[PDB]
Design a protein around this ligand. Sequence first.
Ligand code: HEM
Length: 151
Amino acid sequence: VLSEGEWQLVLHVWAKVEADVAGHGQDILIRLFKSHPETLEKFDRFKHLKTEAEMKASEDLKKHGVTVLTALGAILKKKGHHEAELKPLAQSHATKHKIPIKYLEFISEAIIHVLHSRHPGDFGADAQGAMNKALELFRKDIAAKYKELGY
Ligand code: HEM
């Protein structure tokens, strides 16, 4: 359970992300796919991409990065009271897309890394710890839905 102080640190840096949702989404997906190539393989839309330059040149990838970060932002702004937002996401990711929780840990690492690169003055250790907590909460609550579904 995040404190109010922790949520403030999370949403302070998130408001910086929302000035360039698309650029952040590209940086995060590419870091994910480079660092953990099994994740790329889960996307029929993207598994043709073989180099970082190809990934950076894909408009479809950029579009999906906006979808991802828009969903995550809506969850973060609920400060934990995110049950309604997680239901559809956990159902699609468990049952349709077949995304292990571990891959959710991998994208959380990518988010944290890109936030540090883009927003160091608003992403010192206190804010890094708070964002880690927020993304852990996200994962914990998705994992419980996965367990219900048998995934
Ligand atoms: C912050 C974590 C994530 C968020 C907020 C997120 C959000 C979304 C949203 C909003 C969609 C479209 C609606 C839906 O199908 O539910 C989607 C689709 C999808 N996601 Fe995620 N996602 C996350 C992480 C991941 C990860 C780590 C993987 C893969 C390793 C992944 C794989 C997929 C796939 C394969 C689709 C369908 C893409 C398509 O073919 O159009 N997601 N995601």
